């Protein structure tokens, strides 16, 4: 099952085109939450929607500051996805789940693509 | 035109898995070269082929490695081919002449993938 | 010699400060500049500093964002003053030109700031 | 304390160097294995090595290949140090102070270049 998660700050976003460019990549269901990045010890929807996904599920975010504004705690959340085999996607970054030389090759430039990523999250 | 390059230290390393690999992405000519990636200084069949292509032309390797082992040189031969309006291909690599997704990040991310590879190239 | 450029878009930032942390890095003139980051295009001013400096001198900002909010012109500006034989330092992270003797930690490292700055500064 | 770990899978390598090596910068007491990077499974010297450093201490190696040839294994083993609160220094390499001037680029700067390291030590 492909699965999204959707998250503003306030409502002064653009919710509607994350929602849509959420459903452009085919989530099913959508779990949406209006609260900060800054933690993931106070966001219950993030932990109803990763709680939700099992192996084989697809778990797709506009971008990565969506999941959180903490390199730590994105890393971690990104690594149990990893360990629940659930495949992350990015819709601003679709090329990140292509395939990359051989598997050691692979996983590691997937390391480095989602540490740029939850790097650039924090540092803006 | 498509143009490739192929090298090897050593005729042991299985040079004709690499050119029938340069052949099957298209190269009409190939400029094959017995030495060492670590320089560009001693290596006058890569000058030839650099020499040899011009705006509109294909210049293809199978990895990044094959251009060379050796970061700031690298860099400089795909700055060149950039100035020089010669696309680069790389036959592993095939997402580098493809736009998906959000055309900025999209470039943002190729861009230090090939600059991580060409690391990684002279690292080894 | 040492030359500084400055940038606010608006009175209300601290744009004292910015110039406090020039002149402490050395600048002997500081360009500043009351305008958007957005766009090279209208700041003569920038334009001015880049024309001012030359071979052997040094470009000094307090960071990437000031020199631009345009990933792909903030890296034009980057080539041109390399280009021109101009170091850039940005004081906000004074470390990065000191020479190592390994590319990990010296062009490679920052390339890869330099870039990732340059796009944050675009996406915030 | 400073502390070294040598590694070689054979005596045809030159130990007696790597020891140097380590004495040079300084190690005060070196465990030494004779035994394959594949795996931390089949090292007792590694793991009396890691358990002998405490909180304060600085654990020195020639390059991370001596470490291990195992990217997910190293990973894991400079993980246990930094949770220890165990200076890792790299002798062909050394990041103990900061490379950039700031916290979170200085953590990514670090965890991208180990990790280029340990993927070629594998690679290798």
Not at 19 to 34: D, H, M, Q, S, Y
């Amino acid at each position: 099952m492909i699965i999204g998660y959707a998250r503003v700050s306030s409502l002064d976003q653009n919710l509607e085109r994350q929602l849509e460019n959420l459903k452009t990549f085919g989530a099913e269901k959508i779990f949406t939450e209006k609260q900060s990045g800054k933690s993931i010890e106070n966001r219950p929807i993030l932990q109803k929607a990763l709680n939700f996904v099992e192996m084989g599920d697809r778990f797709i975010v506009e971008s990565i500051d969506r999941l959180g504004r903490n390199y730590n705690e994105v890393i971690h959340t990104v690594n149990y996805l990893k360990d629940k085999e659930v495949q992350l996607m990015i819709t601003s970054l679709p090329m990140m789940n292509e395939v990359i030389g051989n598997p050691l090759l692979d996983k590691f430039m997937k390391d480095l693509i989602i540490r740029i990523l939850a790097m650039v999250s924090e540092q803006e």
